[PDB]
Design a protein around this ligand. Structure first.
Ligand code: CL
Ligand code: CL
Ligand code: CL
Ligand code: CL
Ligand code: CL
Ligand code: CL
Ligand code: CL
Ligand code: CL
Ligand code: CL
Ligand code: CL
Ligand code: CL
Ligand code: CL
Ligand code: CL
Ligand code: CL
Ligand code: EU
Ligand code: EU
Ligand code: NA
Length: 128
């Protein structure tokens, strides 16, 4: 599923991402934009051979099992394929663990590089 901007914002908010670990809603929407362009079906290989899955591009090196990432952990106890669902419940639940891991949203390199320090509130501009 490709989410609308305000649609995804509404969904993330309902799942409790709004100011989760102090990260306001726009931070989360902004991250999704540059990780997946709002597409729950997005997958991308990383150089280390792990794969990123879903709206928030959650890595198979640590967070989910895809069965082809050697020496990896499945810390959200979930098959990676479940992060591609049009229901973002699993991604959001997993993202809460990731963001709580110590470095906050810096875990998403694209967030640090493209969202951090910017006017992220614009990402929820006009949404109810
Ligand atoms: Cl957009
Ligand atoms: Cl990740
Ligand atoms: Cl694996
Ligand atoms: Cl393969
Ligand atoms: Cl290896
Ligand atoms: Cl594990
Ligand atoms: Cl599995
Ligand atoms: Cl949803
Ligand atoms: Cl933090
Ligand atoms: Cl990670
Ligand atoms: Cl990441
Ligand atoms: Cl800005
Ligand atoms: Cl801006
Ligand atoms: Cl915001
Ligand atoms: Eu990646
Ligand atoms: Eu760690
Ligand atoms: Na894994």
């Amino acid at each position: 599923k490709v989410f609308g901007r305000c649609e995804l914002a509404a969904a993330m908010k309902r799942h409790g991402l709004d100011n989760y670990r102090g990260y306001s809603l726009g931070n989360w929407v902004c991250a999704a934009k540059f990780e997946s362009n709002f597409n729950t079906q997005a997958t991308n290989r990383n150089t280390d051979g792990s794969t990123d899955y879903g709206i928030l591009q959650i890595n198979s090196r640590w967070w989910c099992n895809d069965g082809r990432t050697p020496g990896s952990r499945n810390l959200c106890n979930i098959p990676c394929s479940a992060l591609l669902s049009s229901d973002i419940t699993a991604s959001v639940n997993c993202a809460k663990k990731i963001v709580s891991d110590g470095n906050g949203m810096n875990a998403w390199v694209a967030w640090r590089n493209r969202c951090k320090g910017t006017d992220v509130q614009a990402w929820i501009r006009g949404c109810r």
